């Protein structure tokens, strides 16, 4: 069973085009294969520091920069979103059905 914290790169209406361009990071705690809680971290100068402090297990995004990939892939597994829908993607994540990004 998965017990993990996952960061998702979000626009107000959908998963964003990139980790870099998002409005906010949605921090989801998944426990006994269920979403238990959520939190918004705005993608501003402070939010960029905050996301590191969260110590997430995984990121879900559509695209990510070489720099951010280099930084986060040391510790964090980075998964590629499939379409725009965050709930569909959280489900796919839990099911083990998202692909792990190897190069941005």
Numbering used by the authors: 1 to 104
Q: Please, what does the article write about this entry?
A:
The hypothetical protein NP_247299.1 is the gene product of locus MJ0327 in the genomic sequence of the Methanococcus jannaschii genome. Its function is unknown, but on the basis of sequence similarity the NP_247299.1 protein has been assigned to the dinitrogenase iron–molybdenum cofactor family (PF02579). The fold topology of NP_247299.1 resembles a ribonuclease H-like motif, with a three-layer α/β/α architecture.
The crystal structure was determined to 1.7 Å resolution at 100 K using a crystal obtained at 277 K from 100 mM Tris–HCl solution pH 7.0 containing 50%(w/v) PEG 200. The NMR structure of the protein NP_247299.1 in solution at 313 K has been determined and is compared with the X-ray crystal structure, which was also solved in the Joint Center for Structural Genomics (JCSG) at 100 K and at 1.7 Å resolution. The key message is that the two structures of NP_247299.1 determined with current JCSG methodology either in solution at 313 K for NMR data collection or in a single crystal at 100 K show very close coincidence both globally and in residue-by-residue com­parisons. Relatively high displacements are observed for residues 10–15, 30–34, 44–48 and 66–75 in the crystal structure and for residues 35–39, 42–46, 52–56 and 73–75 in the NMR structure. Along the polypeptide chain, high B-value-derived displacements are noted for four segments (residues 10–15, 30–34, 44–48 and 66–74). In particular, for residues 10–15, the electron density is unambiguous and does not show any evidence of the Asp11–Val12 peptide flip indicated by the NMR data. Residues 30–34 did show some minor differences between the initial REFMAC5 model and the rebuilt phenix.refine model, but again there was no indication that the backbone adopts multiple conformations. For residues 36–39, where the NMR data are interpreted as a ‘sliding β-bulge’, the maps are once again unambiguous, without any indication of multiple conformations of the backbone. While there is clear-cut NMR evidence for the presence of two local conformations formed by these six residues, we found no evidence for multiple conformations; the conformer with cis-Pro104 did not refine well and was pushed out of the density in each case. Moreover, the carboxy-terminus hydrogen bonds to Lys36 in the symmetry-related molecule and to two waters, which together appear to stabilize the trans conformation.
